[model samples]
Target: GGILMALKRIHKELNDLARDPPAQCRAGPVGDDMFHWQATIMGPNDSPYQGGVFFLTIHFPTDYPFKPPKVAFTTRIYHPNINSNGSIKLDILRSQWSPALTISKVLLSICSLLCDPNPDDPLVPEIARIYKTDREKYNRIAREWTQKYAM
Candidate 1:
């Protein structure tokens, strides 16, 4: 019911990433396995969250993939894909999803999301507006957040 998808994904991700994981990255559910898995995503290099360890909680549905998993940030940060509270808005995470997708792919996508945010549809409208109107300003804000929270 909670983070089930994340756990399933984690199982697959573990297999894919057969090597020792980064000290900064970890995944495990809280009590009861009810559904929240804490994750620390190392921001992509040179990206706004670059070198920054972004905290996130993944909430999976009772039925996953067919239904998108819910993810929220526990760390405070700024990004086009993330809300102030750390909630992320992604396509497959909501509407565009498939069972074949794995955690490694999702994590990679999250990294890509940090690298290039999509303004066409954004959960953070201000971030989207900024992204659509001004690339430099948007990058500046992202960089600032990276420095403040992620750095």
Candidate 2:
């Protein structure tokens, strides 16, 4: 019953994403696994990550929606909230998630995060410090990494 419910919800989401894709982001199941998905986010034009294309992996739990899906960047990013391992320090993906949320919403949140990082709550302290203190240097390195790994 739990698995069936999860699958149904996942299918609905896939159709909705197909019908009305989110801006700057796209997601779809990987190969034959509905439970596993691959997504991409185009960098925001106003941010240092501009021109980069970021990739992420998503995995839905058997009791999904009740549990937030596991999402992680597959492409390396240089940001305060995103670590070298591609783990993101975001609230909604962790303790603040709600069943009402969808993958579209999460992806949009990630897009906003790219534009405006939350340095106070950071995954990479050094990056956060640079983001806080050295604005130009931070933007330069972030852009460099985006060109190197994401472009």
TM-scores for all candidates: the values are 0.75, 0.98
Per-residue lDDT tens digits for candidate 2, residues 1-151, read 8999999999998898888888889999999999999999999998999999999999998889899999999999999999878898889999999999988888888999999999998899999999999999999999999999998
Following a full C-alpha superposition, what root-mean-square deviation does model 2 have from the true structure? 0.7
Per-residue lDDT of candidate 1, residues 70-131 (tens digit): 77778777766777777778887766688777544566677677778887778788878988
Model 2 error, position 114 (Å): 0.6
Worst 10 residues of 2 by lDDT: 16-25
lDDT for model 1, on a 0 to 1 scale? 0.69
Which residue pairs in candidate 2 collide? none
The pairs that clash in candidate 1 are: 2-34, 2-35, 3-35, 3-60, 52-150, 73-86, 92-96
**CA RMSD per model (angstroms):** 3.8, 0.7
